[PDB]
Design a protein around this motif. Structure first.
Motif, PDB file in Angstrom:
ATOM      1  N   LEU A  34       0.879  -1.207   0.000  1.00 46.71           N
ATOM      2  CA  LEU A  34       0.000   0.000   0.000  1.00 46.71           C
ATOM      3  C   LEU A  34       0.906   1.244   0.000  1.00 46.71           C
TER       4      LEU A  34
ATOM      5  N   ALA B 211      -3.407   1.782  -4.431  1.00 43.73           N
ATOM      6  CA  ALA B 211      -3.259   1.832  -2.965  1.00 43.73           C
ATOM      7  C   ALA B 211      -4.625   1.644  -2.308  1.00 43.73           C
TER       8      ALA B 211
ATOM      9  N   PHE C 247      -5.768  -1.881  -2.210  1.00 42.80           N
ATOM     10  CA  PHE C 247      -5.137  -2.663  -1.121  1.00 42.80           C
ATOM     11  C   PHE C 247      -5.813  -2.342   0.213  1.00 42.80           C
TER      12      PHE C 247
END
Ligand SMILES: [Cl-]
Ligand SMILES: [Cl-]
Ligand SMILES: [Cl-]
Ligand SMILES: [Cl-]
Ligand SMILES: [Cl-]
Ligand SMILES: [Cl-]
Ligand SMILES: [Cl-]
Ligand SMILES: [Cl-]
Ligand SMILES: [Cl-]
Ligand SMILES: [Cl-]
Ligand SMILES: [Cl-]
Ligand SMILES: [Cl-]
Ligand SMILES: [Cl-]
Ligand SMILES: [Cl-]
Ligand SMILES: [Cl-]
Ligand SMILES: [Cl-]
Ligand SMILES: [Cl-]
Ligand SMILES: [Cl-]
Ligand SMILES: [Cl-]
Ligand SMILES: [Cl-]
Ligand SMILES: [Cl-]
Ligand SMILES: [Cl-]
Ligand SMILES: [Cl-]
Ligand SMILES: [Cl-]
Ligand SMILES: [Cl-]
Ligand SMILES: [Cl-]
Ligand SMILES: [Cl-]
Ligand SMILES: [Cl-]
Ligand SMILES: [Cl-]
Ligand SMILES: [Cl-]
Ligand SMILES: [Cl-]
Ligand SMILES: [Cl-]
Ligand SMILES: [Cl-]
Ligand SMILES: [Cl-]
Ligand SMILES: [Cl-]
Ligand SMILES: [Cl-]
Ligand SMILES: [Cl-]
Ligand SMILES: [Cl-]
Ligand SMILES: [Cl-]
Ligand SMILES: [Cl-]
Ligand SMILES: [Mg+2]
Ligand SMILES: [Mg+2]
Ligand SMILES: [Mg+2]
Ligand SMILES: [Mg+2]
Ligand SMILES: [Mg+2]
Ligand SMILES: [Mg+2]
Ligand SMILES: [Mg+2]
Ligand SMILES: [Mg+2]
Ligand SMILES: [Mg+2]
Ligand SMILES: [Mg+2]
Ligand SMILES: [Mg+2]
Ligand SMILES: [Mg+2]
Ligand SMILES: [Mg+2]
Ligand SMILES: [Mg+2]
Ligand SMILES: [Mg+2]
Ligand SMILES: [Mg+2]
Ligand SMILES: [Mg+2]
Ligand SMILES: [Mg+2]
Ligand SMILES: [Mg+2]
Ligand SMILES: [Mg+2]
Ligand SMILES: [Mg+2]
Ligand SMILES: [Mg+2]
Ligand SMILES: [Mg+2]
Ligand SMILES: [Mg+2]
Ligand SMILES: [Mg+2]
Ligand SMILES: [Mg+2]
Ligand SMILES: [Mg+2]
Ligand SMILES: [Mg+2]
Ligand SMILES: [Mg+2]
Ligand SMILES: [Mg+2]
Ligand SMILES: [Mg+2]
Ligand SMILES: [Mg+2]
Ligand SMILES: [Mg+2]
Ligand SMILES: [Mg+2]
Ligand SMILES: [Mg+2]
Ligand SMILES: [Mg+2]
Ligand SMILES: [Mg+2]
Ligand SMILES: [Mg+2]
Ligand SMILES: [Mg+2]
Ligand SMILES: [Mg+2]
Ligand SMILES: [Mg+2]
Ligand SMILES: [Mg+2]
Lengths: 174, 174, 174, 174
Positions: free
Chosen positions: B20, B62, B65
């Motif tokens: 991330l 990101a 995730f």
């Protein structure tokens, strides 16, 4: 080394080139079956068109391996495309039996390539085979098996009326 | 223990948080490249917009995730997003070389996370990486490699006309 | 003897099979050129797509000879499709020079087949070649010659900017 | 001499009149086959309609020769249209065998007319035959051959169910 190459083993690169060749070989075999069923003394045009379409799909499978090779930074290496094992295919049952064996040969090569990709810890190549090749092979093997069962039920090879009916009802009208 | 958690190793949870962070770092680097190519003394606006769009896509990576972590019952833990390695990016060739290396760094982290998920026998996490991240990385590495080849053909860094033409013809008009 | 056969000499039947093979060979050469220009270290995608489309058209030319053979009562006989003469094609100028020579090789074989059909007093085969093959060959030779003239004007092989511009402006955007 | 006549040999003019007559003869034979398959004790209506349509097309072929004769400045000379060789046509297989022979008789006359036009150096008449008659003959001979192969596979003449199925599936629904 190609600037894009990452986690791509030389053995997998070579095996992709061999798999490419086998797809072209399968295409050419289906081309031969198309031409046979288009003969005036065979004349099963829906069967002919089924095999012609299969020939085109196998060529597309080969082209997708060429694109894959370049995406990973491998280098396409071509070899001769061997002519098919037969010049004439007997009848719809014999041709479908040969198609079943060809599809299981292609499937075994794809499974062997997956084993190699697994051994070399290449999840991208594993995913590519699982997502683009392995399920299409299971579906196309099942379709041909179903056809063989129906050709046997229709009395092939002796029952010409059964062969005629298969071409009208089992394969797409073309 | 989260009520939803099943077959989700603590090590994978932690590695997802680190991944991330790396996606956010990649986003921020692309933001920096956008701002550089938007400078009045650089002024390659299609190149700038290419990097801006990449910045947005990495932020989306990101966020995916974060959502994944919560779906599995892990807990998102954030760390500082480090500033990019450079404040200025030279020219289109230097920036694309840095982008290629960044994309291969992100790819290596994704492959390392797949290795960990494999070791911990987590097929859901393996599938997530294969289905949502690994092919996009191969495609985006190939695109940047193709761009670098073309920037070299166009005579970068010395050939300013070549750099101008790349911005007009190689990247989307914005 | 096929029930449909009329005025179709064995020599013409055999020459049609050889011509079929040459069309497949030409297809395969163009496939190789597609894969080369798709390489990350070549990366001329409109040139690549030009050759891919040519590969498909040559395969269609082969299939039309298969259909022709069966319409006349001849029997398709396939041979190996030989791999292309090169594994790598240098640059756009070298590839186009090889394409020009390939198209003139195919044209010479078509003209030789027309001579044979004339000698055997086969006006149907003469018409087929004149109506389906010979004008397409003259047009495609002219197109490639025009391209070579433009690649030379653009300073190939040394002028990378010229090569870049050819891919943007001379071949269809793909 | 007609004011329009140029490069048109008397022998070709006469041969065009004979060819015209043969087209009308072929039309009349197909009319007879239509009427036979429309009989209440034959009753294969799709087969009947196939032959009726063929009768109309052969009449159109004759009319196109009349128009051709006048375009070149020759003079249409008509002769009796002889009745067909049979009054009854047995069954679908016997009729299709007779149709194949009729189409090959017409084809041979067209090829003989092309030989004469070639001998008299009449490229307009050669082109007319190649562009308007010779390929249609090859296609229609192939179609009838394919039908005969299928009628044999369906067990004609003995297999009445096979004959019934041919009329439903091999010829257009009318
Ligand atoms: Cl590697
Ligand atoms: Cl790795
Ligand atoms: Cl390696
Ligand atoms: Cl190899
Ligand atoms: Cl060998
Ligand atoms: Cl054989
Ligand atoms: Cl096999
Ligand atoms: Cl699949
Ligand atoms: Cl039987
Ligand atoms: Cl039925
Ligand atoms: Cl039905
Ligand atoms: Cl757990
Ligand atoms: Cl478990
Ligand atoms: Cl744990
Ligand atoms: Cl953490
Ligand atoms: Cl730190
Ligand atoms: Cl800096
Ligand atoms: Cl990096
Ligand atoms: Cl992906
Ligand atoms: Cl310069
Ligand atoms: Cl320009
Ligand atoms: Cl432009
Ligand atoms: Cl013959
Ligand atoms: Cl003849
Ligand atoms: Cl012969
Ligand atoms: Cl041969
Ligand atoms: Cl050899
Ligand atoms: Cl080479
Ligand atoms: Cl050549
Ligand atoms: Cl043409
Ligand atoms: Cl130069
Ligand atoms: Cl005259
Ligand atoms: Cl003259
Ligand atoms: Cl005269
Ligand atoms: Cl007369
Ligand atoms: Cl008489
Ligand atoms: Cl009679
Ligand atoms: Cl006759
Ligand atoms: Cl025609
Ligand atoms: Cl029977
Ligand atoms: Mg390099
Ligand atoms: Mg190697
Ligand atoms: Mg092999
Ligand atoms: Mg395949
Ligand atoms: Mg061999
Ligand atoms: Mg799937
Ligand atoms: Mg399918
Ligand atoms: Mg298939
Ligand atoms: Mg099914
Ligand atoms: Mg039998
Ligand atoms: Mg709780
Ligand atoms: Mg933990
Ligand atoms: Mg980190
Ligand atoms: Mg990312
Ligand atoms: Mg710091
Ligand atoms: Mg995917
Ligand atoms: Mg994308
Ligand atoms: Mg990206
Ligand atoms: Mg691209
Ligand atoms: Mg300069
Ligand atoms: Mg026979
Ligand atoms: Mg022979
Ligand atoms: Mg040859
Ligand atoms: Mg060709
Ligand atoms: Mg060799
Ligand atoms: Mg001629
Ligand atoms: Mg012509
Ligand atoms: Mg033409
Ligand atoms: Mg064209
Ligand atoms: Mg062409
Ligand atoms: Mg032009
Ligand atoms: Mg140079
Ligand atoms: Mg007068
Ligand atoms: Mg006269
Ligand atoms: Mg007569
Ligand atoms: Mg006629
Ligand atoms: Mg009489
Ligand atoms: Mg024509
Ligand atoms: Mg027609
Ligand atoms: Mg007809
Ligand atoms: Mg047909
Ligand atoms: Mg009976």
């Amino acid at each position: 080394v190609s600037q894009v190459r990452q986690n791509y083993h030389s053995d997998c690169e070579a095996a992709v080139n061999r798999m490419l060749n086998l797809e072209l070989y399968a295409s050419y075999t289906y081309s031969s079956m198309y031409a046979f069923f288009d003969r005036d003394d065979v004349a099963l045009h829906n069967v002919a068109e089924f095999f012609k379409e299969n020939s085109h799909e196998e060529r597309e499978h080969a082209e997708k391996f060429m694109k894959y090779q370049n995406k990973r930074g491998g280098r396409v290496v071509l070899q001769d495309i061997k002519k098919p094992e037969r010049d004439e295919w007997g009848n719809t049952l014999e041709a479908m039996q040969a198609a079943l064996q060809l599809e299981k040969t292609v499937n075994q090569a794809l499974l062997d390539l997956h084993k190699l990709a697994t051994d070399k810890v290449d999840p991208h190549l594993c995913d590519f085979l699982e997502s683009e090749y392995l399920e299409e092979q299971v579906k196309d093997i099942k379709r041909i098996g179903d056809f063989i069962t129906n050709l046997k039920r229709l009395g092939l090879p002796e029952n010409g009326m059964g062969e005629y009916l298969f071409d009208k009802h089992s394969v797409k009208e073309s």
